[PDB]
Structure formats: C-alpha cells, structure tokens
Amino acid sequence: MIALSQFNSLSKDEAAGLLAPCVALPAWGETLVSLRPFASRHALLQTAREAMANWGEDELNAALSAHPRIGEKPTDSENERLAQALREGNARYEARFGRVFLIRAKGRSGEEILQALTRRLQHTADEEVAEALAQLREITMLRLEGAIGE
C-alpha cells in the first residue's frame, strides 16, 4: 500500500501501473489517474465507484478475457462433496455463459459460494451479466482499498 500523496505525485504511467492489478480495464485506471490530485481516500473511492458505475457487457468481456478457466491449472465427506460440487458447477457455468465464474469470495464460505453458483446457473443471460458486473465492481473496489492509503 502507498500513501495517497504518493499516488498524486507519481507519473501518469506509474500511477496507471499501480492501479492495473485492480481490474484488467486500462480505461478505468486512466480515468482515475487523469482526475488527480485526490484530497482524501474517501473522495478517491467515490470517484472510483463513479468510473465503474457504467461498465457494461463489453467491459465484463474485456476484463475477464485473460482469466484462467477452471480446467487450466492442473495440480465420503462434506468437504469432498462441496469441493466436487463447486468444481462441477464451475465447469457448467463456463459452458453455459462462455466466461469464467466471477464472484467476490472474501467473506463468503465455500457453501455460500456454491449457493450463489447454483442460483446463477439458473439465471437468464441478462441477469448473469448484471450480477457478474456487480461482482467485478466489488472485487475492483476491494483491491483499490488495499492499494492506496490515506
């Protein structure tokens, strides 16, 4: 984590590089960099929310285009059944929607993630675009919160 004053004093490209891990959407970071300086962390986060508010399906597609799929990292009990259900459901999600399963995981149990996955598998395409974007927005904000301090 860097200080807000550091973020303000970085070059346009240095500041963009700092924001890059938050989300794979260069335009979002470039927008925030262009609106410097920021007088408080709260104010920066407010601007960050505005900048991602109008993300659509095109942004979702671009942001997830390089994300590893469930089968792309090759390595009875409640845990075994949960792990298997999570893996199978994740595989079916990819086949149904043509994208990685995106969910804000921090604060959610494995069971809670399975609940969400099972429900989202029964979504219409439009409902799922909306929820996936919401998850993308939540993840991006959490990453930004860890990147820049007061």
Measured CA to CA, the distance from residue 1 to residue 145 in angstroms comes to: 9
φ and ψ at residue 148, rounded to 5 degrees? -130, 130
Torsion angle, CA of 54/56/59/63, rounded to 10 degrees? Answer: 100
Where do the structural domains in the chain lie, given as residue ranges? 1-150
CATH class of 1-150: mainly alpha
Question: What does the DSSP assignment read for the chain?
Answer: -B-HHHHHHS-HHHHHHHHGGG-S-HHHHHHHHHT---S-HHHHHHHHHHHHHT--HHHHHHHHTTPPPTTSS----HHHHHHHHHHHHHHHHHHHHSS------TT--HHHHHHHHHHHTT--HHHHHHHHHHHHHHHHHHHHHHHB--
State the first-to-last Cα distance of the chain, in angstroms, to the nearest integer: 10
Method: X-ray
In three-state secondary structure terms, 68 is: coil
Going by C-alpha positions, the residue among 145, 81, 124, 131 that lies closest to residue 101 is: 131
How far lies 107's CA from each of 7, 71, 139, 142, in Å?
28, 25, 12, 12
Do 23 and 122 touch, CB atoms closer than 8 A?
no
82 close to 111: Cβ distance less than 8 angstroms: yes
Tokens of 134: 């919401």
Phi, psi for residue 141 in degrees, rounded to 5: -65, -45
